[PDB]
Amino acid sequence: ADFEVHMLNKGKDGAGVFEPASLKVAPGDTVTFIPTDKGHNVETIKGMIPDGAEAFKSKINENYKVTFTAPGVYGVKCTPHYGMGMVGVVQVGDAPANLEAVKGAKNPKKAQERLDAALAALGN
C-alpha cells in the first residue's frame, strides 16, 4: 500500500508539520512525502530507526518516496525544521520491538513533545 504525508507550514504549527504525523504501515508499504508547501524535506532521526533499516534523507522540496520494510518504529524529521518540532513517526508492523529504544532517543524539546504525542497516537 502507498500512503501520503504532506509537508506543510502555511497556517501550521512552528516552522511546519508533517500531516499525518503518525502512520501505521506494513512491510513493503511506501510513504510519499509531498512538498505541498515549500521549504521542507524528510530525514531519518538518528537513534530512531530499527536495525535492518537504512537511513534516508531527501532534498528540499523533493517529492520523495520511501519504502519501509524492517519492522519497528521510525522517527523522521524535516532537516531545517527539526529544532522547531517538524517531525513524525512511521510504525512498520505491530508490536514494534524497538519501541523502548525510540522512546528514549534524544531530540530537541519541540521535536520530543511531538514525537511523544505521535508515538501515543499509534496506540503505543
Applying CB under 5 A, among 8, 17, 86, 115 the residue interacting with Cu ion is 86
Residue 40 binds Cu ion, judged by CB under 5 A: yes
Q: DSSP per residue over 38-98, as a string?
A: SS---EEPTT-S-TT----BPPTT--EEEE--S-EEEEEE-TTTTTTT-EEEEEESSS-TT
Residue 16 binds Cu ion, judged by CB under 5 A: yes
Minimal distance, residue 40 CB to Cu ion, in Å: 3
Q: Which residue is nearest to Cu ion (CB)?
A: 78
Number of alpha carbons in the 13 Å side-chain half-sphere of residue 42: 27
Binding residues: 40, 78, 81, 86
Q: Which residues bind Cu ion (CB under 5 A)?
A: 16, 40, 78, 81, 86
